[PDB]
Amino acid sequence: MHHHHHHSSGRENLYFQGHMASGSEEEVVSVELPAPSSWKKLFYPNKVGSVKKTEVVFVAPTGEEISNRKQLEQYLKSHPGNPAIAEFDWTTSGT
Protein backbone atom coordinates (compact mmCIF):
# COMPACT_ATOMS: atom_id res chain seq x y z
CA MET A 1 0.00 0.00 0.00
CA HIS A 2 1.71 3.22 -1.31
CA HIS A 3 -0.61 4.91 -3.91
CA HIS A 4 1.73 7.06 -6.07
CA HIS A 5 -0.11 9.51 -8.39
CA HIS A 6 1.24 11.46 -11.45
CA HIS A 7 -0.06 13.85 -14.17
CA SER A 8 1.57 14.59 -17.58
CA SER A 9 -0.19 15.69 -20.81
CA GLY A 10 3.11 15.14 -22.70
CA ARG A 11 4.33 18.42 -24.25
CA GLU A 12 4.77 21.86 -22.60
CA ASN A 13 4.37 24.41 -25.45
CA LEU A 14 4.20 27.99 -24.01
CA TYR A 15 5.99 31.33 -24.74
CA PHE A 16 7.00 33.94 -22.11
CA GLN A 17 8.87 35.64 -25.02
CA GLY A 18 6.89 38.95 -24.85
CA HIS A 19 10.10 40.82 -23.84
CA MET A 20 11.98 42.69 -26.65
CA ALA A 21 14.84 43.19 -24.08
CA SER A 22 17.38 46.11 -23.97
CA GLY A 23 16.11 49.77 -23.83
CA SER A 24 19.12 51.07 -21.83
CA GLU A 25 21.59 53.82 -22.95
CA GLU A 26 24.01 52.00 -25.31
CA GLU A 27 27.67 53.12 -25.95
CA VAL A 28 28.39 53.63 -22.20
CA VAL A 29 32.14 53.32 -21.36
CA SER A 30 33.33 50.47 -19.03
CA VAL A 31 36.89 49.45 -17.97
CA GLU A 32 37.40 45.87 -16.61
CA LEU A 33 39.46 46.20 -13.36
CA PRO A 34 41.46 43.20 -11.76
CA ALA A 35 39.54 40.44 -9.84
CA PRO A 36 39.49 36.73 -8.70
CA SER A 37 39.75 34.63 -11.94
CA SER A 38 36.50 32.85 -10.86
CA TRP A 39 34.67 36.22 -11.23
CA LYS A 40 35.29 39.39 -13.25
CA LYS A 41 35.46 43.00 -12.03
CA LEU A 42 33.97 45.77 -14.16
CA PHE A 43 33.86 49.51 -13.42
CA TYR A 44 31.73 52.06 -15.30
CA PRO A 45 33.87 55.32 -15.41
CA ASN A 46 32.84 58.72 -16.81
CA LYS A 47 34.97 61.84 -15.97
CA VAL A 48 35.51 62.75 -12.24
CA GLY A 49 32.38 62.55 -10.01
CA SER A 50 30.14 65.66 -10.56
CA VAL A 51 28.58 63.95 -13.65
CA LYS A 52 25.84 61.35 -14.53
CA LYS A 53 28.26 58.46 -13.59
CA THR A 54 27.58 54.71 -13.03
CA GLU A 55 28.84 52.43 -10.15
CA VAL A 56 30.81 49.12 -9.93
CA VAL A 57 29.39 45.82 -11.34
CA PHE A 58 30.99 42.37 -10.61
CA VAL A 59 30.44 39.74 -13.35
CA ALA A 60 29.56 36.28 -11.94
CA PRO A 61 30.99 32.90 -13.29
CA THR A 62 27.35 31.87 -14.14
CA GLY A 63 26.41 35.33 -15.60
CA GLU A 64 24.15 36.15 -12.56
CA GLU A 65 25.97 39.50 -12.18
CA ILE A 66 26.03 41.84 -9.15
CA SER A 67 25.21 45.61 -9.49
CA ASN A 68 25.68 46.59 -5.80
CA ARG A 69 27.71 45.45 -2.74
CA LYS A 70 24.69 44.00 -0.79
CA GLN A 71 23.91 41.58 -3.70
CA LEU A 72 27.56 40.35 -3.53
CA GLU A 73 27.39 39.29 0.19
CA GLN A 74 23.92 37.64 -0.14
CA TYR A 75 25.18 35.89 -3.35
CA LEU A 76 28.20 34.25 -1.59
CA LYS A 77 26.14 32.91 1.38
CA SER A 78 23.52 31.54 -1.17
CA HIS A 79 26.27 30.28 -3.61
CA PRO A 80 29.15 28.27 -1.88
CA GLY A 81 32.35 27.81 -3.94
CA ASN A 82 32.42 31.55 -4.86
CA PRO A 83 35.33 33.56 -3.16
CA ALA A 84 34.84 36.04 -0.25
CA ILE A 85 33.97 39.79 -0.73
CA ALA A 86 37.27 40.53 1.15
CA GLU A 87 39.14 40.09 -2.21
CA PHE A 88 36.36 41.95 -4.14
CA ASP A 89 37.54 45.55 -4.78
CA TRP A 90 34.39 47.72 -4.65
CA THR A 91 36.67 50.53 -3.26
CA THR A 92 38.75 50.63 -6.55
CA SER A 93 36.75 53.80 -7.42
CA GLY A 94 37.40 55.50 -4.03
CA THR A 95 40.17 54.97 -1.41
Number of domains in the chain: 1
CA atoms within 13 A on the CB side of 3: 1
73/84 Cα distance (integer angstroms): 8
C-beta atoms surrounding 83 within 10 Å:
13
Radius of gyration of the chain (CA): 20
Convert 12-32 to b/e letters by CB count within 10 Å (16 or more is b): eeeeeeeeeeeeeeeeeeeee
Helix (H) or strand (E) holding 77: helix 69-78
Domain ranges, residue 80:
1-95
40/57 Cα distance (integer angstroms): 9
64 and 81 Cβ atoms separated by less than 8 Å: no
> Of 73, 78, 80, whose CA–CA distance to 38 is shortest?
80
